Every structure is written in C-alpha cells, then in structure tokens.
C-alpha cells in the first residue's frame, strides 16, 4: 500500500492544524516540493492506527484532479505520517470568509464545478464522503478545489461540526439523519449546501437556528434562501439538491454537466435569482 517515504526526505516546518493525537504541518518533501504532513503520535491505539493509515489507503486508490493527491506515508518509523500535496489556500470555508467579495461569479461557479467533478469521481468509485462541506474542500494557488478528509468512522468522529449517531446536522440529508442512510445521494444534498456556502462567501447555513430548528424547518419544507447576486440557474440547481425524495435529486453526473454548460456559456450566469432583503432602507 502506497509509497513509503523515508523520514530524511521530509521536513516539518510549521503547524497548520492540530488535534489531541497529532498535528498537520506544512513541510517540504525532497525525494524539493511543499507538502502537507499529518502525524500520529506514539501511544496510538489499534483503532487509531487503522483509522489513520486507512485515510491514506483510501486516498491512494484515487487519481483525480479534484481529489487530494497522496505522496506517501511514513509507517515504519514513529511518529507515523501521511504526506499529501500542499493546498496553499487551505480550507474553502475560511478562505471565502477571508476573501469576501473578491471573486467573480464565474470563478465561484468554477470552484463548484471542480468540487462536483471530484464528487462524481468518488461516487462512481463507490465512495460516500458523509462529511461534504466547504470546511473539507481545500484550495490551491490555481484556485483548484479538491475534496479532502477521507476514512471510515474517523471522518465524522473527528469533525467538531458533527454532533449527537454523530452527524454534522445542517449539512446532512434528511434520510441520513433519520435512519442512517448515507449514499452518494445524501452527498448530493451536502453539495447543495456547499453551493450555498460558496455563493455566500462562507455564510453559516441556517444562521443561528439550532440543529432541531433546522431539522424541523427542512421537514416542514423550508429551504435556504437565495444568496445575494446568485445566478438563477445556480440557485435552481442547489434547490434540486435539497429534494426530500432522494430519487428526485440530481446525480453528480447531472451537476457536472449543468455547471460545465453554464461555464461554457457564461452569459447564462448574468441572470440572477431575486434576493429577498431582510432590511428595508428607504430614502426620500
């Protein structure tokens, strides 16, 4: 399983993410290229070792532009490490919140197309992500968005947005919440939420509604309102991702096709969905 990298080829330089059992670092790989490096500290359990190397094992099965590339693993020395390509701009949700208003609509839609292409690949590889959200999309210096955060039980266990099953409620499809049915179609629901995150520059879905309030609203038929300056076709597409009936949602194949057609005829994105303002400002 995958390239075993000698520790002398890897230099950890700066902590960029942290947990109780290891950290994520920016570093360099001299087989000299930048890499992300995730560690697992000594004392780890069997389950931790299986979850940790399982993330790398899963990533090693994939070869797609919109899926994080695995460079290799350090497993025969401690601490163990996973080494991936480095995504200079980090997580998409923080990136958009820090860059509010700085992109064109075409750029934002292009990000969505990349995410959708990665998700179509995963779904057709029989991989259900379960935690698709802008926080799990990473962005590089070419503005390419790539799906990250792979594994089995570790995905939802490690995410603080996932609460008690243990689930990140406001990104998750109704059937996954209600009866634990996680499929590529529940990932499509999540993708609809990601579309809303991108078009709003990282607004938190459903604002301050509690988890129960969100579930009640969804079950009563309410959906997130249109973002400001959102192409009508983009809002229509996200709304179809939120059909209660799983079978009525687009597949990722449909999503990629639609986004590709909109990008290739970019004037189609100048028609905007009506934005319902929450504030009335009236001047004589």
Ligand X SMILES: COc1cc(Nc2c(C#N)cnc3cc(OCCCN4CCN(C)CC4)c(OC)cc23)c(Cl)cc1Cl
Collapsed DSSP state (helix, strand, coil) of residue 111 = helix
Nearest alpha carbon to residue 110 among 65, 153, 61:
65
Residues 6+ apart with CB under 8 A from 54: 151, 152, 154
Query: Tokens in use for 18?
Result: 């942290």
x-or-dash string of contact with ligand X, 46-85, rule CB under 6 A:
---------x------------x-------------x-x-
Q: In the complex with ligand X, which residue's Cβ is closer, 18 or 106? A: 18
135 sits near ligand X (criterion: CB under 6 A): no
Q: In the complex with ligand X, which residue's Cβ is closer, 33 or 253? A: 33
By CB under 6 A, the count of residues binding ligand X is 17
Burial label, 237 (beta-carbon count in 10 A; 0-12, 13-18, 19+) = buried
Residue with structure tokens 């460079």?
71
138 sits near ligand X (criterion: CB under 6 A): yes
Among 2, 11, 89, 257, binds ligand X (CB under 6 A): 89
Q: In the complex with ligand X, which residue's Cβ is closer, 149 or 249? A: 149
Active-site residue identified among 51, 93, 131, 159: 131
86 sits near ligand X (criterion: CB under 6 A): yes
Among 5, 10, 29, 36, binds ligand X (CB under 6 A): 36
Among 54, 57, 79, 90, binds ligand X (CB under 6 A): 90
> What residue ranges in 131-277 does DSSP mark as E strands?
137-139, 145-147
x-or-dash string of contact with ligand X, 149-178, rule CB under 6 A:
x-----------------------------
What's the closest the beta carbon of residue 48 comes to ligand X, in angstroms?
13
Site for ligand X in 192-221 (CB under 6 A): none
Beta-bridge partner residues of 146: 138
Distance of CA 204 to the CA centre of its chain: 14
Among 9, 16, 233, 263, binds ligand X (CB under 6 A): 16
| Annotation: binding site | 16-24, 38
SS3 content of the chain, % helix, strand, coil (to 5): 40, 15, 40
The total of other beta-carbon atoms located within 10 Å of residue 244's CB is 13
87 sits near ligand X (criterion: CB under 6 A): yes
| Annotation: binding site for ATP | 16-24, 38
230 sits near ligand X (criterion: CB under 6 A): no
Residues 6+ apart with CB under 8 A from 212: none
- CB distance 212 to 164 below 8 Å: no
What is the C-alpha to C-alpha distance for residues 41 and 104, in angstroms, rounded to an integer? 42
- State yes or no: is 276 an active-site residue: no
Nearest alpha carbon to residue 139 among 192, 94, 169:
94
Binding-site ranges for ligand X (CB under 6 A)? 16-17, 24, 36-38, 55, 68, 82, 84, 86-87, 89-90, 138, 148-149
Catalytic residues: 131
């Amino acid at each position: 399983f995958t390239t075993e990298i000698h520790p002398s080829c890897v230099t950890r330089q700066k902590v960029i993410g942290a947990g109780e059992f290891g950290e994520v670092y920016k570093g360099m790989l001299k087989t000299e290229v930048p890499v992300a490096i995730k560690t697992l500290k000594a004392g780890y359990t069997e389950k931790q070792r299986v979850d940790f190397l399982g993330e790398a094992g899963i990533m090693g099965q994939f070869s797609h532009h919109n899926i994080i590339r695995l460079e290799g693993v350090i497993s025969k020395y401690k601490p163990m490490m996973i080494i991936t390509e480095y995504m200079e701009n980090g997580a998409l949700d923080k990136f958009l919140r820090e860059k509010d208003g700085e992109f064109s609509v075409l750029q934002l839609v292009g990000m969505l197309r990349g995410i959708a292409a990665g998700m179509k690949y995963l779904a057709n590889m029989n991989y259900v992500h379960r935690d698709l959200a802008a926080r799990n999309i990473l962005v590089n210096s070419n503005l390419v968005c790539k799906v990250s955060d792979f594994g089995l039980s570790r995905v939802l266990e490690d995410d603080p947005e996932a609460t008690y099953g243990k689930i990140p409620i406001r990104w998750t499809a109704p059937e996954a919440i209600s009866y634990r049915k996680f499929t590529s179609a529940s990932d499509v629901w999540s993708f609809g939420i990601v579309m809303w995150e991108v078009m709003t520059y990282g607004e938190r879905p459903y604002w301050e509604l509690s988890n129960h309030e969100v579930m009640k609203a969804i079950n009563d038929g309410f959906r997130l309102p249109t973002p400001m300056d959102c192409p009508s076709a983009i809002y229509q597409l996200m709304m179809q991702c939120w059909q209660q009936e799983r079978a009525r949602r687009p597949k990722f194949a449909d999503i990629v096709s639609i986004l590709d057609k909109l990008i290739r005829a970019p004037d189609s994105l100048k028609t905007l969905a009506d934005f319902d303002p929450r504030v009335s400002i009236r001047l004589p």
